[PDB]
Amino acid sequence: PLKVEKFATANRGNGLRAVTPLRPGELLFRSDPLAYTVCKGSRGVVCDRCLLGKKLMRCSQCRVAKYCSAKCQKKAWPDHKRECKCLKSCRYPPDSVRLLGRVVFKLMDGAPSESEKLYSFYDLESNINKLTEDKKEGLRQLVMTFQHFMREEIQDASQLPPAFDLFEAFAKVICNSFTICNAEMQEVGVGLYPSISLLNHSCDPNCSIVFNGPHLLLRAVRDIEVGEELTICYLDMLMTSEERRKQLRDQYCFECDCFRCQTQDKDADMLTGDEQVWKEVQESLKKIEELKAHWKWEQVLAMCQAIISSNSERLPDINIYQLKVLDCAMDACINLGLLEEALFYGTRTMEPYRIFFPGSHPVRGVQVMKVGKLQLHQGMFPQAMKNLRLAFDIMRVTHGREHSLIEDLILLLEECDANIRAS
Numbered sequence: 001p002l003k004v005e006k007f008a009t010a011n012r013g014n015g016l017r018a019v020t021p022l023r024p025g026e027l028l029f030r031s032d033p034l035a036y037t038v039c040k041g042s043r044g045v046v047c048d049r050c051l052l053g054k055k056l057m058r059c060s061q062c063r064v065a066k067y068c069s070a071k072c073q074k075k076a077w078p079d080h081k082r083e084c085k086c087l088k089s090c091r092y093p094p095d096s097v098r099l100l101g102r103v104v105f106k107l108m109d110g111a112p113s114e115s116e117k118l119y120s121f122y123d124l125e126s127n128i129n130k131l132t133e134d135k136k137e138g139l140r141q142l143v144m145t146f147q148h149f150m151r152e153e154i155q156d157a158s159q160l161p162p163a164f165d166l167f168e169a170f171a172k173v174i175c176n177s178f179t180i181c182n183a184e185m186q187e188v189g190v191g192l193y194p195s196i197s198l199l200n201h202s203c204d205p206n207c208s209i210v211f212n213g214p215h216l217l218l219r220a221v222r223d224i225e226v227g228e229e230l231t232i233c234y235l236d237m238l239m240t241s242e243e244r245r246k247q248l249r250d251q252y253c254f255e256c257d258c259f260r261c262q263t264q265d266k267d268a269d270m271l272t273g274d275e276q277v278w279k280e281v282q283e284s285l286k287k288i289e290e291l292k293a294h295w296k297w298e299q300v301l302a303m304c305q306a307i308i309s310s311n312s313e314r315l316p317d318i319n320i321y322q323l324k325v326l327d328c329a330m331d332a333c334i335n336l337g338l339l340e341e342a343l344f345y346g347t348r349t350m351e352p353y354r355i356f357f358p359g360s361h362p363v364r365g366v367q368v369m370k371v372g373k374l375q376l377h378q379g380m381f382p383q384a385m386k387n388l389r390l391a392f393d394i395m396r397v398t399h400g401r402e403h404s405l406i407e408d409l410i411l412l413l414e415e416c417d418a419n420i421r422a423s
């Protein structure tokens with residue numbers, strides 16, 4: 001019996017609303033993707049199928065798809081078989097083109113997907129009548145890129161779903177793509193989850209999604225009344241209202257009416273410090289984030305240290321650009337085994353994260369868990385326990401028992417508690 005239902009909103013198209021009262025942490029829907037792929041930077045770093053990092057085995061035919069195990073390579077074959085001949089034949093396509101290829105193959109060759117239970121690819125919003133000419137030109141180039149990439153497998157409309165229009169399909173992709181994140185909150189893939197696509201956006205949402213490999217869990221993060229619309233935040237929380245406005249216009253074709261956008265909620269705190277410094281850090285973050293997307297941790301760390309410990313002027317840790325640098329440095333340190341330095345950066349992020357991730361947000365839950373884990377392994381048992389319990393309080397809501405990371409957290413809590421009891 002579903003706790004959610006599709007409905008027609010007054011001014012935001014279709015949406016999802018609660019059928020029953022919902023409490024924080026309640027699992028509302030779970031879904032595998034209709035189609036998904038690894039993102040360009042994680043290609044060859046994580047398994048194409050399960051999206052875990054490993055030391056990967058490549059598909060011998062295309063040598064593009066890479067896998068953690070024979071199980072994953074073999075299980076991925078039915079959904080990889082047709083794209084394999086295309087990847088071989090061609091130059092690597094934009095993620096959206098690889099994704100749409102997988103959409104087409106799934107719709108043509110696969111049984112009806114549970115991911116389409118509430119809403120299908122065919123139903124998705126295209127926003128075509130809101131696209132500006134520059135966006136239409138970009139979509140036309142994507143169409144032509146798809147036609148080139150897919151030519152070994154799709155030569156005519158007979159090989160697309162009935163009356164499938166590639167321009168419209170890419171228009172849907174742009175406003176319906178989910179960024180799949182691994183357990184550590186590294187972006188690793190992109191997917192379409194058409195039932196989940198019913199959720200409209202809020203900058204202060206009542207639900208949240210989290211990924212466990214390709215699998216998506218939708219949970220309430222506030223109390224929700226019968227009939228109330230369910231929302232998620234499509235965006236990183238570490239964004240000003242101007243940045244949100246740009247992304248919601250450019251990618252989603254809407255103007256956000258939430259209270260936060262009307263009042264520039266938190267913008268001024270997010271932009272504290274000297275503007276010339278944070279403008280330079282924001283510019284450096286383009287390169288830092290590009291390096292991070294490719295798992296280049298040593299280079300990430302070097303760039304971050306040059307900011308965090310700059311000889312030149314510095315930023316407060318609440319400035320969002322400084323905060324993003326701290327977080328990249330922490331993750332680089334964790335992945336590099338520099339656990340004392342990781343804890344220094346991670347600890348600094350804790351109060352800004354408390355402010356910018358109000359309520360229960362999976363990114364804060366994960367960050368607090370990382371900090372608690374670092375403290376636990378440094379023997380700081382009471383401090384680790386407070387953070388691990390805080391992470392559990394958040395992650396019971398945002399992740400829940402169905403997400404494997406919660407089991408890892410429970411292990412840390414038991415280890416930490418055992419230490420405290422032996423002290």
Ligand SMILES: NCc1ccc(S(=O)(=O)N2CCC(NC(=O)c3cc(C4CC4)on3)CC2)cc1
Pocket residue numbers: 175176177178179180181185186187197232233234235236237362363
């Ligand atoms: N610095 C890395 C980072 C990792 C994780 C997050 S997150 O967990 O907060 N989060 C991921 C999911 C994303 N949302 C989507 O991709 C998305 C797409 C849509 C609908 C289909 C348009 O709804 N959510 C919104 C940000 C933020 C930054």
Ligand SMILES: C[S@@+](CC[C@H](N)C(=O)[O-])C[C@H]1O[C@@H](n2cnc3c(N)ncnc32)[C@H](O)[C@@H]1O
Pocket residue numbers: 011012013014015123124125127175176197198199200201202251252253254255256257
């Ligand atoms: C993932 S879909 C959400 C479901 C969509 N309303 C539909 O009818 O299919 C994203 C699109 O929904 C609309 N949208 C989402 N959140 C909105 C909001 N807060 N205000 C207005 N439109 C919104 C925009 O058209 C956006 O591109």
Ligand SMILES: [Mg+2]
Pocket residue numbers: 123124125126
């Ligand atoms: Mg429509």
Ligand SMILES: [Mg+2]
Pocket residue numbers: 127
């Ligand atoms: Mg419309």
Ligand SMILES: [Zn+2]
Pocket residue numbers: 047048049050051052067068069072
């Ligand atoms: Zn795998």
Ligand SMILES: [Zn+2]
Pocket residue numbers: 059060061062063064065080083084085
């Ligand atoms: Zn292959």
Ligand SMILES: [Zn+2]
Pocket residue numbers: 202203256257258259260261262
């Ligand atoms: Zn808003």
